[PDB]
Structures are given as C-alpha cells and as structure tokens.
Amino acid sequence: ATKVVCVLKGDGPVQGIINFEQKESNGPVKVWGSIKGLTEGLHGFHVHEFGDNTAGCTSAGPHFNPLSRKHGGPKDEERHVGDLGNVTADKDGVADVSIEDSVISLSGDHCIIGRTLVVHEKADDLGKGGNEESTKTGNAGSRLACGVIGIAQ
Amino acid sequence: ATKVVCVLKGDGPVQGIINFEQKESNGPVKVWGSIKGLTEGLHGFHVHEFGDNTAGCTSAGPHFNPLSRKHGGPKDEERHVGDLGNVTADKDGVADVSIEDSVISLSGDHCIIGRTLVVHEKADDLGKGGNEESTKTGNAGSRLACGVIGIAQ
Ligand SMILES: O=C(NCc1ccc(Cl)cc1)c1ccccc1[SeH]
Ligand SMILES: O=C(NCc1ccc(Cl)cc1)c1ccccc1[SeH]
Ligand SMILES: [Zn+2]
Ligand SMILES: [Zn+2]
C-alpha cells in the first residue's frame, strides 16, 4: 500500500491533516482526515498543480489538470484530475473528510505527490454555475489553507 | 529543467525558501535559496525520509537513507542520500544557501520529491564525532525548520 499525507495551514484559523491511501496500484484512493476552523457548510476541496507555497496558497497555481479538461464535480466525466468536490463543516467548524476517488492516483500518470491540497472559502459549484469562472474553479473562492502532499510513514 | 521548491517553517523564527533544479535527468542538482533567523555559524542541512509534518518536523523521520548507509558529509562515499552537509549563517542570521549535489535527484528511483528538507540547530559533524549519534544524525541537534519538497513551475 501507498500512504501519503498533507498538513493544511493558512493565514486564518483553518488547519487540518488529510491522509491518502491507495491499496491497489491503479485503484481508488481513500482520502480522509479532519479540518477545523471552517465556516459551517460546503468548502471546495482540490488538488492544485504546484507544490509551491512560496507566496502562500496562491503559488499552488490552478486545479491539477493534466488532461486539459473543464472543471467538474468528482463524479463528472468532464473534470480536472484535482477536482475532489466539497467537504462539509459542521456547526463547530469541523469537517470530517472522507472521500474515495478513482481519478487521482498515488502512482503512475496522475500522481498527486508533491502537489498542493487546498480547502477553499465557499462551495464548489461543480461546474454548474453557468459562468466562465464555474468551469475553471467552480466559484470556490479564496484558498483558506493548503499543504504540499508528501510521502507518509 | 525540472524545478522543485521547499518552504521551511518551524516553531522558532527560522524560515526560508529553497529551490532545487536539475538540468539533466541523472545529472547534478543545484540547491539554492535563503534562510533567515538562524544563529551565526554552521547548520546541518538534510533531506529527511517523510513528507510528513503531522507532528511538526519530528514526523519527517530520519535522514533519507534508501541505500542503508551511515551518516556522512556530502563529499563522502559513505553517506545518506539526504546528507547535504552544512549551510552557513552570517552575522545577521541569514544563510545564502548554494549547493550542488549529485546523489540526490529530482527524477529516478530515489527522488526527493514529496520528502522533507530540514535545517538543524547546530553544525553537522559529517559523521566524525566518534559517537553513535554522529553516524546517524551528525549531531546536528534539533529541527529548526522544515518543509515538504514540492513541484514548482
Ligand atoms: O512515485 C513517486 N515517488 C516514489 C514514492 C511514492 C510514494 C511512496 Cl509512499 C514512496 C515512494 C512520485 C514522485 C513524484 C511525483 C509522483 C510520484 Se508517484
Ligand atoms: O519522476 C517520477 N514520477 C513522475 C514525476 C516526474 C517528474 C516530476 Cl517533476 C514529478 C513527478 C518518479 C517516479 C519514481 C520515483 C521517483 C520519482 Se521522482
Ligand atoms: Zn477543477
Ligand atoms: Zn545523514
């Protein structure tokens, strides 16, 4: 098995740890962990292109998009590889993340190792917002917290 | 080139940005950048095994050691892959890092992408300290700052 981890930090109170695990080599990736300090409700959750935090979360660049597609929800055929949809924060500002995705990978063509995971300000509209922004970023707003995706023990 | 970057943060005032660049695929890696907030003098500078910051720099694990050797200076044949020797901080607590290494790589089996770079409290004795600690950590002391090594533009 391949295990990967990411610690999310940012300028505000948002922080969390997200684990990634992939049992079979080309098979699904379990993404789980906890984020705290979020406003109640949906928050966009994406792998961006660059493991670059030199200028905060901004320098992470756009959603990881090796196949040059438009932005979607994780379940869409038309999506960015990094398009992991939303996470939900409870009334206490805690999101108990648990996702399974078959498009991201921890080995081979769509490896997300050394890239950035970002949790965004607002809901990801999953590309159904009917503006240009929707098909790029899902209108998820600013980057509350991020981290480089690294090899874990 | 293949370009990689790492933002070092920790508990104290130590922080910096380190760039890694590798022009040829099996060729030398240029490591450069700046770290500030250091005490004047030598500081141990290593790639540790895990891109894991879940418990601060501690969770990064030992020096990256895929060939199971004892700790050395970068110039030694007997070294950890992650053994990059020392960086020097000037009277202002700034280290202008500039290193070239042919053992680390940004592509190939023992890639350092998604691992951790750490700058340590004291000098790395390059394994010549005559105790057990010397042949493991070079006696470089605590981890002042670290970051996950991520893909840059
Ligand atoms: O394959 C990679 N590095 C080897 C490795 C992966 C995971 C683990 Cl747990 C240990 C070792 C790698 C490097 C860079 C980008 C994507 C990938 Se996928
Ligand atoms: O090169 C690798 N995997 C894909 C990749 C290439 C280049 C870059 Cl910049 C990022 C990711 C790779 C495979 C195996 C072990 C270590 C490594 Se590093
Ligand atoms: Zn997207
Ligand atoms: Zn070492």
Quick one: resolution in A?
2.8
Structure tokens at A111: 């490896």
| 3-state SS record for A103-138 | CCECCCCCECCCCEEEEECCCCCCCCCCCCCHHHHC
Strands of A1-132, DSSP E: 2-8, 15-22, 29-36, 41-48, 54-57, 83-89, 95-101, 116-120
Task: Report how far apart, in Å, the C-alpha atoms of A109 and of each of A3, A82, A105, B55 are.
Answer: 17, 13, 8, 30
Q: In what order do the strands lie in the sheet with A143-148?
A: A143-148, A116-120, A41-48, A83-89, A95-101, A29-36, A15-22, A2-8, A150-151
Partnered with residue A57 across adjacent β-strands are A55
User: How many helices and strands, by DSSP H and E, does chain B display?
Assistant: 1, 10
CB neighbours of residue B53 within 10 Å: 25
Domain extent for B21: 1-153
Rounded to whole angstroms, how far apart are CA atoms A66 and A132?
20
The residue annotated as part of the active site, out of B43, B79, B115, B143, is: B143
| Cβ pairs bridging A and B (under 8 Å) | 88
Q: How many Å is the maximal CA-CA distance in chain A?
A: 43
User: Is B43 part of the annotated catalytic residue set?
Assistant: no
Q: Which of A148, A149, A153 to mutate to test the interface with B (most CBs of B within 10 A)?
A: A148
Task: Measure in Å the smallest separation between the Cα of B116 and chain A Cα atoms.
Answer: 8
Are the C-beta atoms of residues A114 and A149 closer than 8 Å to each other?
yes
Give the burial class of B88: count Cβ atoms within 10 A of its Cβ; 0-12 exposed, 13-18 middle, 19 or more buried: middle
Enter the DSSP assignment of B67: T
Structure-block tokens of residue B112 = 């350092």
List the structure tokens of A143. Answer: 């980057």
Name the residue type at position A112.
Answer: I
- How many angstroms separate the most distant Cα atoms in chain B? 43
Task: Flag if A53 and B7 touch (Cβ within 8 Å).
Answer: yes
Chain B hits for A149, CB-CB cut-off 8 Å, are 51, 114, 148, 150
Q: Please identify, by atom number, the ligand 2 atom nearest to the C-alpha of residue A114.
A: 10
Burial class for B122, CB neighbours closer than 10 Å (0-12, 13-18, 19+)? middle
CA distance A143 to A145: 6
Q: Which long-range contacts (CB under 8 A, 24 or more apart) does A136-139 make?
A: A136/A62, A136/A63, A136/A70, A136/A71, A137/A44, A137/A62, A137/A63, A137/A71, A138/A44, A138/A71, A138/A83
On whether any CB of chain B is under 8 Å from the CB of A149, the answer is yes
Quote the CA–CA distance of B104 and B30 in Å, as a whole number: 10
For B8-41, letters b (16+ CB in 10 Å) and e give bbbeeebbbbbbbbbeeeeebbebebebebbeee
Alpha helices for B3-145 (secondary structure H): 134-137
Q: Is A152 helix (H, G, I), strand (E, B) or coil?
A: coil
Experimental approach was: X-ray
Contact between A54 and B147 using a beta-carbon 8 Å cutoff? no
Phi, psi of A135 (to 5 degrees): -85, 0
Which residues 6+ apart lie within 8 Å of A3 measured at CB? A19, A20, A21, A151, A152, A153
Strand-strand pairing, A150-151 and A2-8: antiparallel
SS3 B87: strand
Domain count, chain B: 1
Ligand 1, pocket-test mutation among A23, A47, A109, A113, most atoms within 8 A of CB: A113
Instruction: Report which residue type is found at B29.
Output: V
Whether A48 sits among the annotated catalytic residues: the reply is yes
E-only strand ranges, B102-152: 116-120, 143-148, 150-151
Q: How far is CA B115 from CA A37, A80, B42, B52, B132, in A?
A: 27, 25, 23, 8, 25
Considering every ligand atom shown, identify the ligand nearest to the alpha carbon of residue B4 and give its number: 2
For residues A49 and B150, give the distance between their C-alpha atoms in angstroms, rounded to a whole number: 10
Nearest ligand to the C-alpha atom of residue B71:
4
Cβ contacts of A105 on chain B, cutoff 8 Å? none
By the 10 Å C-beta count (0-12 exposed, 13-18 middle, 19+ buried), A27 is classed as exposed
Rounded CA-CA distance A97/A17 in Å is: 10
Active site residue B110: no
Integer Cα distance of B134 and B5 in angstroms: 28
